[PDB]
UniProtKB/TrEMBL annotation:
Belongs to the CRISPR-associated Csm5 family. This subunit might be involved in maturation of a crRNA intermediate to its mature form. This is CRISPR system Cms protein Csm5. The chain holds residues 147 to 195 of 340 of the full protein.
Length: 49
RNA sequence: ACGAGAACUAGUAAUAAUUGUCAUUUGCAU
């Protein structure tokens, strides 16, 4: 419940990732999943499963 | 025909000699 979590932000440190080789890269469409499905006109590249 | 008249307070040598504008202190927490 935001217990001074902004202060602990400085006391928790995350290093960046190691590289991601291409073969795990693929393109996906944005899907608006509601009771009837709809597509978003553009795509986003994503990391594969 | 003046207790007068002559007569460079002159010559030699410097501000020198050893010293550092240094000693610590994250362009930092989203």
């Amino acid at each position: 419940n935001n217990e001074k979590n902004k202060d602990i932000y400085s006391k928790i440190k995350v290093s960046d990732s190691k590289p991601i080789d291409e073969s795990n890269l693929a393109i996906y469409q944005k899907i608006d999943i509601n009771k009837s499905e709809k597509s978003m006109p553009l795509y986003r590249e994503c990391i594969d499963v």
